[PDB]
Amino acid sequence: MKMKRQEYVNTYGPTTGDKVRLGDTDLWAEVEHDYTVYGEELKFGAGKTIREGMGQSNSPDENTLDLVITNALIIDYTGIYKADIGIKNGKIHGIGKAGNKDMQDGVTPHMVVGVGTEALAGEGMIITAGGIDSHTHFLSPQQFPTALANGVTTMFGGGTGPVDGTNATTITPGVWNLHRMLRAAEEYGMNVGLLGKGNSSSRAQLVEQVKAGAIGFKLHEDWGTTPSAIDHCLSVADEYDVQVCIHTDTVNEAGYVDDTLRAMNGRAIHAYHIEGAGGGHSPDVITMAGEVNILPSSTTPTIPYTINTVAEHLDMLMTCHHLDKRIRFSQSRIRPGSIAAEDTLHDMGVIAMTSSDSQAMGRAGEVIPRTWQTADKNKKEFGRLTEEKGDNDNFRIKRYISKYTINPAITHGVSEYIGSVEEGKIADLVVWNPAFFGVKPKIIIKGGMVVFSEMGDSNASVPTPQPVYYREMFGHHGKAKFDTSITFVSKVAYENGIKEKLGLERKVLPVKNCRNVTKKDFKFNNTTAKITVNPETFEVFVNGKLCTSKPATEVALASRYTFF
């Protein structure tokens, strides 16, 4: 039977060829393929499809799903398509067509909707992987709800709380502090991974930290990012398969950018705040982004480049670093050049990741909005990518989503567990209403359970009455949080029973394959170039051509959605 196109879309969401506007941006996601059989679509409700002996099977099956996300529009590096998502044992069991092979055609064999299946209507919603924020300062436990409310499910970084060392660096230093923090982590719904102090010219002190559970090291200048410490840190990371993150020598005390790059010696390193305002060799830190071994990321305050970016920084630097009021400027000439370039470099796929720098020159609940604000800004400036095939922004979308999902996962050695909407991975997913895509999520699923969501009046006759605000769900509570949350550790710690030894009840998993990740390993952001900075004009150049962008006067996913 023939169904009117408008009626189909209202009932089941968009199909092949339909274009969805992401929020209030000018980015259009086109449905590349639909895995359904028209007439066999699953709908939940009274007299609907998912019912005993109809859409829901009465035949027992080894693949009876625990949850079915019906008619989802997946947005992932793997593709922008329409499919039913099946969760089982807190993992993505299957992606395709769910239902009952007894009564329906074209059912994906391992996607059985049965007696034990829960239903979640994804018709007309966008489903994405949970974001990974690889630059977290563990300064305040209040960052976690803010992060979840913005689609972030995993946070890598360091800290002890609101102590000077943490206020400046992503470091949980030494055995005792690492043990304390890993035990503190039990409280939360957020997946965590801690970095120890990398700034050492002695092996013993670095090794102690990996064995204490660290997922890597952070080399920060406040602790001395000298070539000796760069070499010693990377040597230990190479031995123990852990990641290294870097905040370079801003003042050029022990050498220039090339001296730091030489110390690294082509070894894998996550270069934090690649632009330089967050810190690093003045004025040429950005030049590192061109190198194959350098895994670069951006922090939130500089992306997207706005008419207030420079003004905000010329004071935000003084509160964070605690500088004299006698100091006025240098940053007024250096900063515009690199902040403008940064946006372009993201669009070119030169900068592979987005991070926060939470409460230490950056915003906790801004990674996802700011990534899409930049994508939108660039689409508005540079136009539709030439890489696109059709009247859509799919390639650009895939490039940008990879920045906070898959690419941080690859960098930190957790790509096998999380990072993307793929069969076999842990079910850390975010459900979005297209009108609120990238700004306000609907449901946060972690380990196959809803952990956080937008919820109305607790007394109310339905879940919709006002005030609708973000609240913790069952998956975030009791002993169920131990089932839905992961504390990542090094292989050495994992293999030596850190879980048992520290009495951690959370899922403990090792980080692996950190050392041989280069730019080539990323998804949609594998671009290498010859990046240069004029030491007089501070202008950034990609392959001899000036790399710049215009500052935005207004941004998408902002003014329409927020009260304050």
Binding site: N150, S202, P227, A254, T306, N308, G365, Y470, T562
Partner: protein, 225 residues
Amino acid sequence: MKLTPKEQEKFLLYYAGEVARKRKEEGLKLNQPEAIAYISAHIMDEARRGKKTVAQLMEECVHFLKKDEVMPGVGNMVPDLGVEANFPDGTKLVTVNWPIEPDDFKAGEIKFASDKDIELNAGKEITELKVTNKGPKSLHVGSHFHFFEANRALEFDREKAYGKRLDIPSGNTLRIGAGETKTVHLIPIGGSKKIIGMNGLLNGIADDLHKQKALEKAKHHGFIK
């Protein structure tokens, strides 16, 4: 509405600002939290109107509250104020230096024993040294960095800087601009002079015995031309 935990915080801040406004209208001299909330609410209002820049607001809010509009010591208690607000271009941090005009009263006031200067690194032998930053970019060198191991861009008699550091306050840095020439004051490193790390030119005690080896490593690595 989908109110984020940060939006819930801002409501309290804004309401506190509204209460403070009411009390000022009653003719009451505002206290520390009232003064902060009064200025914060103004910043939040102007940001919503989206007609002023962050730069404009930072300037506009200096002495937003006058000494007689607040209780004594309030201004000195609040030397700076920070408030994040959503502008048409997104959330931006508004940093105000001296938002409340100070007075003669100071809570937590420190009264010095003497106005006399503090002799730092007392009794250490000062070595005067001419240094030139022959590099294209400016650089700084910290108080406890082994001067001998400084960026190869710096041109000086490295032999004379062996086992020494800058005679400057602990935690301070000395700037040498691109092309700039300066006379630095060096003092011998404290403790055992066991120099481990930095550029790895020494990695041991800075004695006469290690010196030739260190000078050879410095030359080989390009520090000594």
